[PDB]
Amino acid sequence: MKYLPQQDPQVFAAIEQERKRQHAKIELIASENFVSRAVMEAQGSVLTNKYAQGYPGRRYYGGCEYVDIVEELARERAKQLFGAEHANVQPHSGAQANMAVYFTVLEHGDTVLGMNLSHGGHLTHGSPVNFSGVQYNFVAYGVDPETHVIDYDDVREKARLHRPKLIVAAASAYPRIIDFAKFREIADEVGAYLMVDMAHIAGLVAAGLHPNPVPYAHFVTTTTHKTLRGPRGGMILCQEQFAKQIDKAIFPGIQGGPLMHVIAAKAVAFGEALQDDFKAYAKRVVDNAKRLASALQNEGFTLVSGGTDNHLLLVDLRPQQLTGKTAEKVLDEVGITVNKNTIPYDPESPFVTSGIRIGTAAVTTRGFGLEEMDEIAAIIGLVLKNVGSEQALEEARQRVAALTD
Amino acid sequence: MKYLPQQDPQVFAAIEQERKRQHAKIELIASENFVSRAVMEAQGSVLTNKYAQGYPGRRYYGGCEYVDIVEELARERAKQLFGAEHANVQPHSGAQANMAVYFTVLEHGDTVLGMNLSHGGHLTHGSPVNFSGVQYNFVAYGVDPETHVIDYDDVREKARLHRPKLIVAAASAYPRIIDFAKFREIADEVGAYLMVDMAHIAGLVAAGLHPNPVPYAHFVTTTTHKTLRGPRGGMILCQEQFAKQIDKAIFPGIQGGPLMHVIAAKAVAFGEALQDDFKAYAKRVVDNAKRLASALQNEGFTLVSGGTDNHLLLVDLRPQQLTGKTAEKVLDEVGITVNKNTIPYDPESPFVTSGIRIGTAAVTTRGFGLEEMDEIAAIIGLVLKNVGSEQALEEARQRVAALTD
Secondary structure (H helix, E strand, C coil): CCCHHHHHHHHHHHHHHHHHHHHCCCCCCHHHHHHCHHHHHHHHHHHHHHCCCEEEEEECCCHHHHHHHHHHHHHHHHHHHHHCCEEEEECCCHHHHHHHHHHCCCCCCEEEEEEEEHHHCHHHCCCCCCCCHHCEEEEECEEECCCCCHHHHHHHHHHHHHHHCEECCCCCCCCCCCHHHHHHHHHHHCCEEEECCCCCCHHHHCCCCCCCCCCCEEEEECCCCHHHCCCCEEEEEEHHHHHHHHHHHHHHHHHHCCCHHHHHHHHHCCCCCCCHHHHHHHHHHHHHHHHHHHHHHCCCCHHHHHCCCCCCCEEEEEEEECCHHHHHHHHHHHHCEEEECCCCCCCCCCCCCCCCEECCCCHHHHHCCHHHHHHHHHHHHHHHCCCCHHHHHHHHHHHHHHHHH | CCCHHHHHHHHHCCCCHHHHHHHHHEEEECCCCCCHHHHHHCCHHHHHCCCCEEEEEEEECCCHHHHHHHHHHHHHHHHHHHHEEECCCCEEEHHHHHHHHHHHHCCCCCEEEEEEEHHHCCCCCCCCCCCCHHHHHHEEEEECCCCCCCCCCHHHHHHHHHHHCCCCCCCCCCCCCCCCCHHHHHHHCCEEEEECCCCHHHHHHHHCCCCCCCCCCEEEECCCCHHCCCCCCEEEEECCHHHHHHHHHHHHHHHHCCCHHHHHHHHHHHHHCCCCHHHHHHHHHEEEEEEHHHHHCCCCCCEHHCCCCEEEEEEEEECCCCCHHHHHHHHHHHHHEECCCCCCCCCCCCCCCCCCEEEEEHHCCCCCCCHHHHHHHHHHHHCCCCEEEEEEHHHHHHHHHHHCC
């Protein structure tokens, strides 16, 4: 940075703290990642200066010839990556991508069936304090109380009982592969649309490490951040038959001018994801998560669903008589960043919880491998088994610093 | 840029075209501006890597100590700039700022009174193809057919007849000062909330060159781009009594994670706007617009409302028997960027129009003054009076290049 340090000492000092924080801590929040210098440069570009409401070749302002090339690069690379018939790369966020799909196919008060929020469903999949739950009538399917795998018979029964116009699959805290074929079969049985929110698993899907929802879903939404390792923002993928309606939902439906600089950054991230080394990266993410799961179990921890098929795991802390809130707090003391997270059938409130959610995307990006997974598990064991020992926490602190350098 | 050129030649080449385009053209689109290198650096920062759902000191993820400082810097500087009791700097866009206010005070189907869209009201103030017009029952007040000034008696009569829960004031194409005191008086008479969307005039308000809506409105929304010359995004200002509800509307109501890098950039832009030289800049914007208006009238053009009180003007092209679409097209040929824009009581569709909208914020930022305004008016006269003369257009092209260098 050349100009910011001079122009704004206060903002610069805070950014510099955050940069050093990102290096010093072990980032295990499952939705986090570190983007490339190329992605940031694209976001830091003069493209912020351009109004480009509308779509490539069909804009409502002149002078869009070059931002059109950028947006088309993003749409085409997205289509290559996921094999979708249509892409919309304008959503400001995962929230707005979801919002636009709902706006496309639902009327106010329509019934929607989504994953139980406390079993791993997202806020925008029907929270009563979110637009989704306020605007539409959400009902939930659950996971099995023992296996913690989605109960597909429950998905079916809820669908047949409630007759939703739309079924939503995908999750913010589900550690196993989702069976999109079964979701579509259920949708077909009740004449519902299927939407898949792949935000968490999008990078794994791109790398062929999770089944692709695109062939099974009418709509696929995602964040461009998370496992896809892109800038913060949203995207919609859909069948050609919904392209016009989806585009109109985003604009003029729910947004105005797109963030052209962020779209440039999306194009860059999609370019990176198309490369062989991103496939190798994503495999290491899943390999690391499996290793971390097994190493945690070796430390005596219980995992929701008994392990993981993806980048993320959930520790059920009930055997240790700890809440997720307590675990999150004490790990923060030693420089390990997790979040408290409800487990399925959690006896605690969402503000306390009995679990912590952990993902390996971020640490894998910084080059951690299997040996590091073992050490992270060992440090978590040391901490959570000795919450009242300042000596144990100091040892943990030192071992965390050894990992991050 | 160091890494983008190597990593992504295609994206870089397009960005470089756009950069050169921004320098070569005369940008008269009234909503456009050029941000500082400091603002871009902040947007290009590692802050994109941080999930920070919630608010400073009340986040749903750990490790937010430094992004909290950044967001608080943005909120505090916004409050200094506009004298508001509360600021929310998280809205992804002007659209989402407006969306959140509506979510806060309205139920589905509630009546809202806003400015006639073809008289200068925005898409999010009730377009039937926008969420605003679909979700709520919008009615419109108009400007006087002769003066093109808002008819405050019409605002009142519509309010008394329709009994809206909310009145919206502010515009995307209104060249005169808006009387917020009268809006509040009308709101008070019918027991409606008042929302002011100051997106266009926010920089002028910050510089004391347009009356401040904050003391009169329950809610003030704005973009951070436009006359405020910040990054692309939104903001809400409100009275303390609505702070909690407004914050909950943005999250968990309508958004998820905020764009912390963009918020950093907002803080930077607010810092710049607090400086004396931004006040001088904003005065030159208004001075330039007045000069440009007068110079256009000297060329024989008719202006909507007979001139301007702010950064923007609208040319009524009916005397020249030209549509806005034709004028926009031919100006694009010579390197002058305007948009076709409906005028009040336009006989043409919004896709054709009888007007062009012009603003001086962008050209003022690049250092244009009164002499340049005279020359821009002269070039527009040369072009619009000689639409069939390739020689005239080539002369125009050469004079445009002389201005931009």
